[PDB]
């Protein structure tokens, strides 16, 4: 009933969320890639 | 040398292992005198701290703490999943000693 | 120690906590002599600054400002959601003291 | 303090503002001693540099020079979107002294 | 000058390349005194380190190690394919001494 | 001032500018003591180096040698695509003097 119609969404949203985490992680990690490197030894000596 | 974080964490007395196996929920960074530290939170509750580079530290550490606040945040923007937390539990909040990130 | 931006900030006489739950609208940066700061805006007006290193600033605070302009830039490109800022308001534009990113 | 790049550019006597509102067409960086800088251009045809440090660069803005060379690269890559620059007209190519980012 | 990770590694002793044409499984970063390390784990249960400095190192080293700890992190987040890997097998875990990222 | 890479390069001698017009196939990072370089390789099979921050370099240069090794590693990790590379032909592998990126 409500549970099923509801449950699909619980499920669909859940699915969409984890996938967003791989895209962001790959686009996001990359930008900060060697930026985050200028961040390290220039930054601690 | 440990080959894992668990073997590392008991070489220290006053440590504790935390499997969180999840992504950081929120991240705070401070620059307000004496309160220059980072603060991490989990969905489930857990707040963890990278400590103010006080005197509990050897000089070798100072620059490993800056790499550590960098790692949280990179992992915070990135959304990676932290799987394990090595932490000193004799502080409040708990104090990060090491982090594990396996895919 | 402090365990959140609220508690953290509430530990000073001249600071306030701004609640934004929004993303950085513009990112200004200067290398110019005297003004080597960073300005961050908001669509519903918020304007803040990451002050220049000075007296009012120790040694501990100096790295912290440097590693906070690192964090605005990427909070900006990354398109991040800014939760709450703890600002030293005896200034204009208010200076950032603390940032907390959540979601 | 100034809450703009405009009013910020205004503080100086041989600077001008640049409303581009485009993304860096190119990005070059030399490491070649006596020329450790960076030039960046716009499709419109525009050129600018990030000056090879010193004597006129107070000790302070060295750290700032460097910040902005990192800002120039990551904007290129990430697909930029710079609003305006604040250039010094004493030189050709005009030198960058500050930048806005609007998204 | 050596022309690829292979002829490079060969100048040194107690080394051996390792093909992997893979990616990283784990990332482990410690800050605990005596332990400012990073341990790399490959999906086929392989473990490697990035050692704590100087004893056998050169100061020209100390910044390298600091770039390595760097690289891997975002070698990991990104998802790698650490082609091959030079290593001091005369170690245990085996000490990373070079890395090769292959399309 | 060199208002582009083409000029810039010929400012020097012991050089030659290559239009690579491509993204980077591989990346090697050494940590080997007395071997602290970056090595870029192309599809066409064109090898390059970022000189071990060797004794033939102007202090200013020292800071330059590092950033470069950084433009490499994020252009790589991001399949950015170089335009040209100004390089020293007096070395094998022909060291990198500067880089451009467009389109």
């Amino acid at each position: 009933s409500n549970t099923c119609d509801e449950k699909t969404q619980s499920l669909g949203v859940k699915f969409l969320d984890e996938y967003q985490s791989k895209v962001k992680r790959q686009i996001f990690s990359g930008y900060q890639s060697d930026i985050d490197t200028h961040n390290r030894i220039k930054d601690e000596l | 040398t440990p080959q894992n974080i668990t073997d590392l964490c008991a070489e220290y007395h006053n440590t504790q292992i935390y499997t969180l196996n999840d992504k950081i929920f929120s991240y705070t960074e401070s620059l307000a005198g004496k309160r220059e530290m980072a603060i991490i939170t989990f969905k489930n509750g857990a707040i963890f701290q990278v400590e103010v580079p006080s005197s509990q530290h050897i000089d070798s550490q100072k620059k490993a703490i800056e790499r550590m606040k960098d790692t949280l945040r990179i992992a915070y923007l990135t959304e990676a999943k932290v799987e394990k937390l090595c932490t000193w539990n004799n502080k409040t909040p708990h104090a990060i000693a090491a982090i594990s990130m396996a895919n | 120690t402090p365990q959140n931006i609220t508690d953290l900030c509430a530990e000073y006489h001249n600071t306030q906590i701004y609640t934004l739950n929004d993303k950085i609208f513009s990112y200004t940066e200067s290398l110019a002599g005297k003004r080597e700061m960073a300005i961050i805006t908001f669509k519903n007006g918020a304007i803040f600054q990451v002050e220049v290193p000075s007296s009012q600033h120790i040694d501990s605070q100096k790295k912290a400002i440097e590693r906070m302009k690192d964090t605005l830039r990427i909070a900006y490109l990354t398109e991040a959601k800014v939760e709450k800022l703890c600002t030293w308001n005896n200034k204009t534009p208010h200076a950032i003291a603390a940032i907390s990113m959540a979601n | 303090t100034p809450q703009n790049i405009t009013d910020l550019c205004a503080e100086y006597h041989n600077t001008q503002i640049y409303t581009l509102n485009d993304k860096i067409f190119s990005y070059t960086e030399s490491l070649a001693g006596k020329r450790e800088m960076a030039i960046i251009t716009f499709k419109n045809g525009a050129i600018f540099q990030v000056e090879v440090p010193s004597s006129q660069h107070i000790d302070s803005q060295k750290k700032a020079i460097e910040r902005m060379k990192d800002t120039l690269r990551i904007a290129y890559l990430t697909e930029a979107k710079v609003e305006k620059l604040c250039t010094w007209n004493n030189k050709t190519p005009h030198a960058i002294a500050a930048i806005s980012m609007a998204n | 000058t050596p022309q690829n990770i292979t002829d490079l590694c060969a100048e040194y002793h107690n080394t051996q390349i390792y093909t992997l044409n893979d990616k990283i499984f784990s990332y482990t970063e410690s800050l605990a005194g005596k332990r400012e390390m990073a341990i790399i784990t490959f999906k086929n249960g392989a473990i490697f380190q990035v050692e704590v400095p100087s004893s056998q190192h050169i100061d020209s080293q100390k910044k390298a190690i600091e770039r390595m700890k760097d690289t891997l992190r975002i070698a990991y987040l990104t998802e790698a394919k650490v082609e091959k890997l030079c290593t001091w097998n005369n170690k245990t875990p085996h000490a990373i001494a070079a890395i090769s990222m292959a399309n | 001032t060199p208002q582009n890479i083409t000029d810039l390069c010929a400012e020097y001698h012991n050089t030659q500018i290559y239009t690579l017009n491509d993204k980077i196939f591989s990346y090697t990072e050494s940590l080997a003591g007395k071997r602290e370089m970056a090595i870029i390789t192309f599809k066409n099979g064109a090898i390059f180096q970022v000189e071990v921050p060797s004794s033939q370099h102007i202090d200013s240069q020292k800071k330059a040698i590092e950033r470069m090794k950084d433009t490499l590693r994020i252009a790589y990790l991001t399949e950015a695509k170089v335009e040209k590379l100004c390089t020293w032909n007096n070395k094998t592998p022909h060291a990198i003097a500067a880089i451009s990126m467009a389109n």
Binding site: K7, T8, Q20, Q26, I27 | - | - | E79 | N103 | -
Partner: protein, 192 residues
């Protein structure tokens, strides 16, 4: 693998970058976790088509071959001389509608692959420009498109999709194979 998919969209490439890619209907920025649409394949699969190739109920539809994707849009988006055809790397957020619904697919022939949530700009490999109906074979490569990463991925095993299918609560499928072992809670169920 290095498989590419197709989608004849009108929306400009400039407004996509802005958007974060190609979105379903009622999504504007790709990263809203709190900007929720209905996420349903069943409903998705059977929307009618007012002036857009199917992009309702939390998915965006692709075509597996161009000619196809172009046949389908200058059949639709006809009225516009201008439109683009976006080439799209394959990733595991892509459901083969047919392989999901099976019998119950509202339009087999039509063979769609569907991105749950939409296609992030990084996915979009580049595009064609559609002028005066007739296609323009010149390719506009896409910065933002990660090749190492995408030539390494493929579409999600259909069985990932069995739980997401979205048949009405008392629909036959929920008590048949394969759905019966994948069926969300309160979905058809064990009883009836």
């Amino acid at each position: 693998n290095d498989d590419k998919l197709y989608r004849a969209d009108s929306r400009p490439p400039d407004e996509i970058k802005q958007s974060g890619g190609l979105m379903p209907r009622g999504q504007s920025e790709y990263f809203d976790r709190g900007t929720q649409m209905n996420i349903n394949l069943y409903d998705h699969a059977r929307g009618t088509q007012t002036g857009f190739v199917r992009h309702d109920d939390g998915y965006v539809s692709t075509s597996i071959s161009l000619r196809s994707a172009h046949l389908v849009g200058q059949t639709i988006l006809s009225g516009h001389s201008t439109y683009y055809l976006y080439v799209l790397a394959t990733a595991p957020n892509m459901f083969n509608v047919n392989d999901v619904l099976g019998a119950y697919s509202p339009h087999p022939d039509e063979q769609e692959v569907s991105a749950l949530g939409g296609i992030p700009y990084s996915q979009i490999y580049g595009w064609y420009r559609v002028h005066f109906g007739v296609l323009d074979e010149q390719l506009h490569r896409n910065r933002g498109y990660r090749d190492r990463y995408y030539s390494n991925l493929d579409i999600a095993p259909a069985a990932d999709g069995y739980g997401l299918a979205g048949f009405p609560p008392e629909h036959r499928a929920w008590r048949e194979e394969p759905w019966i072992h994948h069926a969300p809670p309160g979905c058809g169920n064990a009883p009836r």
